[PDB]
């Protein structure tokens, strides 16, 4: 039963990977708070899941701190419960500096999560780099967008990483389901082949290449080149280098009083004029 | 090669070069209703597809895709796993995958879709095509305007030699279930009550089996107030038959007159002409003669006929308005892709795992356009 699992949890059973407490009847805050602490120094559980078990914000606080005090769980499933954003946020801040958890789901709660609670979740997890999948439907375009880009830039760190180690000098690299579809015979309709001959024929219009554009406006080089004019004298005629006098950049009174005076100014000191006209 | 066309409601996936999808199942994920749920689930946390359709009882069904845009990425990953592993019984490592997207999708989403395929499922190669564009290719064309009316939103997408015109894409917030909603509202106003999802699917059926678009509204309105040639009976499951008349066409008149739904937006007929006008004066001619119908809500009888009549009264005198409605425009978005993925010419056009592993998901706006 429960205790058979919990036994193993603090027994550190080298063989219990999943703790599945899904749809388990009559479970307490404390009986889950035990589990939370029962896993507080565990090392053999990668998946802790309590689906559809009247969980609450204490169970969350339980799980939340358990999170910042556990380095082997990659996945937390607190689904179909009765948890508010007061609890959801508990687990959220914990993850502010928790670099192991990789998936968390809180779908299908009691009530609407709210919105301050929703924009919280995004600015909150903003300094998290480890979370890969966040099981929740945001009901707000703003947050939901902010969020998806984050789980993208967390996961690109995986792609960047594999880029450094994986290849770079590593040697090498219960009723009915009403189902009426259609059996097949393949494809007789056609004549989109020619645009593909055309789509091979064209594309990459104008200019685009390179690896990184650290320098300025990697301009397409039609402008730069076609606007010949800027090309000051090259190869032949005058040598125009302006080495001059003997001054330098330590303290200067004339220039820095000038700066002090330039800063202390405003168009409120100038004599009013005007320029509305357009002349024929 | 694989083809996957995701929808705001129904999902169709299958092998490329194929006649039709092998996998067509609802794009839904079910999780327990509430309270002392248990009895129902076993050791599961959710159900997927046509088992989530059969257990609608204690399940609060949700769609990852809303108005054709992925709003739930976790359930989006759930659906995709279900597809390769459960529904299609195939390993996504052994296959390249062509996926689909809505008109005016965010770049952000294009990228997650990209990254999910490459990191999670580990696909050799992948491409992402605008669904409207995939519907034109099935019709055997590369240029034209595609009217796409699905479940949540409507789109008119001008297309020029293989590429959709973003500046000219118009979008309308009326589609499939607004008509189901509407039919429900009037069939109720007239007697029987339709408010529950179980009874809602029969309004979908009253609709699809008995609704049509009139060519001339005010006429068919009066034909019906005059005689009863327009009446048709429908048998409910309990055995009580009901009779609709002017509701057969008052339902899809919403498409042409959104005001019937209290909308200040213009009908699907103007939403198609208006688009053509923000197109180039040198392609309007081939736009008008290549308007193509796509999606399930374009399946009403006489919708092509009404369209022509409307868009000829809007257009200038000299243009021919040809309105093409393929007989299989329910699975056309898939079919148009099934053919694309098979074309020898397309193999160089994929996205390599290498290219991704070097540049990240960002390479998809340039490689796919
Ligand atoms: N013969 C028909 N006549 C009228 N309506 C139909 C017919 N067949 C299907 N439908 C409607 O088609 C709608 C959904 O089909 P479809 O447009 O293919 O959805 P989808 O592609 O999954 N969503 P999206 O990807 O956002 O377009 C429903 O509202 C159905 O009622
Ligand atoms: Mg569609």
From Swiss-Prot, chain A:
Specifically expressed in heart and skeletal muscles, with higher levels in heart (at protein level). Not expressed in other tissues. Mediates nucleation of actin filaments and thereby promotes actin polymerization. Plays a role in the regulation of actin filament length. Required for normal sarcomere organization in the heart, and for normal heart function. Residues 1-230 are annotated as: Interaction with actin 2. GO terms for cellular component: actin filament; cytoskeleton; M band; myofibril; sarcomere; striated muscle thin filament. Changing residue 87 to R: Strongly impaired activity in promoting actin polymerization. GO terms for biological process: actin filament organization; actin filament polymerization; actin nucleation; muscle contraction; myofibril assembly; pointed-end actin filament capping; positive regulation of actin filament polymerization; sarcomere organization. Belongs to the tropomodulin family. This is Leiomodin-2. Keywords: Actin-binding, Cardiomyopathy, Coiled coil, Cytoplasm, Cytoskeleton, Disease variant, Phosphoprotein. Transmembrane segments: none annotated. Residues 254-273 are annotated as: Interaction with actin 3. Residues 198-208 have a biased composition (Polar residues). Residues 155-170, 227-245 have a biased composition (Basic and acidic residues). Can bind at least three actin monomers and thereby provides a nucleus for actin filament formation. Interacts (via N-terminus) with tropomyosin alpha (TPM1) (via N-terminus). May also interact with TPM2 (via N-terminus). Interacts with FLII. Residues 254-273 form the WH2 domain. It comes from Homo sapiens. The gene is LMOD2. The chain holds residues 198 to 547 of 547 of the full protein. It is linked to Cardiomyopathy, dilated, 2G: A form of dilated cardiomyopathy, a disorder characterized by ventricular dilation and impaired systolic function, resulting in congestive heart failure and arrhythmia. Patients are at risk of premature death. CMD2G is an autosomal recessive form characterized by early-onset, severe cardiomyopathy that progresses rapidly to heart failure in the neonatal period without evidence of intervening hypertrophy. GO terms for molecular function: actin binding; actin monomer binding; tropomyosin binding. It is found in: Cytoplasm, Myofibril, Sarcomere; Cytoplasm, Myofibril; Cytoplasm, Myofibril, Sarcomere, M line; Cytoplasm, Cytoskeleton.
From Swiss-Prot, chain B:
One of its GO terms (molecular function) is hydrolase activity. SUPFAM superfamilies: Actin-like ATPase domain. The gene is Act5C. N-terminal cleavage of acetylated cysteine of immature actin by ACTMAP. Oxidation of Met-38 by Mical to form methionine sulfoxide promotes actin filament depolymerization. Methionine sulfoxide is produced stereospecifically, but it is not known whether the (S)-S-oxide or the (R)-S-oxide is produced. Belongs to the actin family. Changing residue 41 to L: Depolymerizes in the presence of Mical. Interacts with Rab6. It is an enzyme of class 3 (hydrolase). The modification Tele-methylhistidine is found at residue 67. In Drosophila there are 6 closely related actin genes. It is found in: Cytoplasm, Cytoskeleton. This is Actin-5C. Its EC number is 3.6.4.-. Keywords: Acetylation, ATP-binding, Cytoplasm, Cytoskeleton, Hydrolase, Methylation, Nucleotide-binding, Oxidation. It catalyses: ATP + H2O = ADP + phosphate + H(+). GO terms for cellular component: actin cytoskeleton; brahma complex; cytoplasm; Ino80 complex. Its main location: cytoplasm. SMART domains: ACTIN (SM00268).
């Amino acid at each position: 039963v429960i205790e058979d699992a919990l036994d193993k949890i603090k027994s550190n059973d080298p063989d219990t990977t999943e703790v599945n407490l899904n749809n388990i009847e009559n479970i307490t805050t404390q009986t889950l708070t035990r589990f939370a602490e029962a896993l507080k120094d565990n090392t053999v559980v990668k998946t802790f899941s309590l689906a559809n078990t009247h969980a609450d914000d204490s169970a969350a606080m339980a799980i939340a701190e358990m999170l910042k005090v556990n380095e082997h769980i990659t996945n937390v499933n607190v689904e179909s419960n009765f948890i508010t954003g007061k609890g959801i946020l508990a687990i959220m801040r914990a993850l502010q500096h928790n670099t192991v958890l990789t998936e968390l789901r809180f779908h299908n709660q009691r009530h609407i999560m709210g919105s301050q609670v929703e924009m919280e979740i995004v600015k909150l997890l903003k300094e998290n780099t480890t979370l890969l999948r966040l099981g929740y439907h945001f009901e707000l375009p703003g947050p939901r967008m902010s969020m998806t880009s984050i789980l993208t830039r967390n996961m690109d760190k995986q792609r960047q990483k594999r880029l450094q180690e994986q290849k770079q000098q590593e040697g090498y690299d219960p009723p009915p389901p009403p189902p009426p579809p259609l059996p097949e015979k393949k494809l007789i309709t056609r004549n989109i082949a020619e645009v593909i001959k055309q789509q091979e024929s064209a594309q990459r219009a104008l200019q685009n290449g390179q690896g990184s554009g650290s320098g300025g406006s990697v301009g397409s080089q039609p402008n730069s080149i076609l606007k010949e004019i800027k090309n000051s004298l090259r190869s032949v005629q005058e040598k125009k280098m302006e080495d001059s006098s003997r001054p330098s950049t330590p303290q200067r009174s004339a220039h820095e009083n000038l700066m002090e005076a330039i800063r202390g100014s405003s168009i409120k000191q100038l004599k009013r004029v005007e320029v509305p006209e357009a002349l024929r | 090669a694989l083809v996957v066309d995701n929808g705001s409601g129904m999902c169709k996936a299958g092998f490329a070069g194929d006649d039709a999808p092998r996998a067509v199942f609802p794009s839904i994920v079910g999780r327990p209703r509430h309270q002392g749920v248990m009895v129902g689930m076993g050791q599961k946390d959710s159900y997927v597809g046509d088992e989530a359709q059969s257990k609608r009882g204690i399940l609060t069904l949700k769609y990852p895709i809303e108005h054709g845009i992925v709003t739930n990425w976790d359930d989006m990953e759930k659906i995709w796993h279900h597809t390769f592993y459960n529904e299609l019984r195939v390993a996504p490592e052994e296959h390249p995958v062509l996926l689909t997207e809505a008109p005016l999708n965010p770049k952000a989403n294009r990228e997650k879709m990209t990254q999910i395929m490459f990191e999670t499922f580990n696909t050799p190669a992948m491409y992402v095509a605008i669904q409207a564009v995939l519907s034109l290719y099935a019709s055997g064309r590369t240029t034209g305007i595609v009217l796409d009316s699905g479940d949540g939103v409507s789109h008119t997408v001008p297309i020029y030699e293989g590429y959709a015109l973003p500046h000219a894409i118009l979008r309308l917030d009326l589609a499939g279930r607004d008509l189901t909603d509407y039919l429900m509202k009037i069939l109720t106003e007239r007697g029987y009550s339709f408010t529950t999802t179980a009874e809602r699917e029969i309004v979908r059926d009253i609709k699809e089996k008995l609704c049509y678009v009139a060519l001339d509204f005010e006429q068919e309105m009066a034909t019906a107030a005059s005689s009863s040639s327009l009446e048709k009976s429908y048998e409910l499951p309990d055995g009580q038959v009901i009779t609709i008349g002017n509701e057969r066409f008052r339902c899809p008149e919403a498409l042409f007159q959104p005001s019937f739904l209290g909308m200040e937006a213009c009908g699907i007929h103007e939403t198609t002409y208006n688009s053509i006008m923000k197109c180039d004066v040198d392609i309007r001619e081939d736009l008008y003669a290549n308007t193509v119908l796509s999606g399930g809500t374009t399946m009403y009888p006489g919708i092509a006929d009404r369209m022509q009549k409307e868009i000829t009264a809007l257009a200038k005198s000299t243009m021919k308005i040809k309105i093409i409605a393929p007989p299989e425009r329910k699975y056309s978005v898939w079919i148009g892709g099934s053919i694309l993925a098979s074309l020898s010419t397309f193999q160089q056009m994929w996205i390599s795992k290498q290219e991704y592993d070097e540049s990240g998901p960002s390479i998809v706006h340039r490689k796919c356009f």
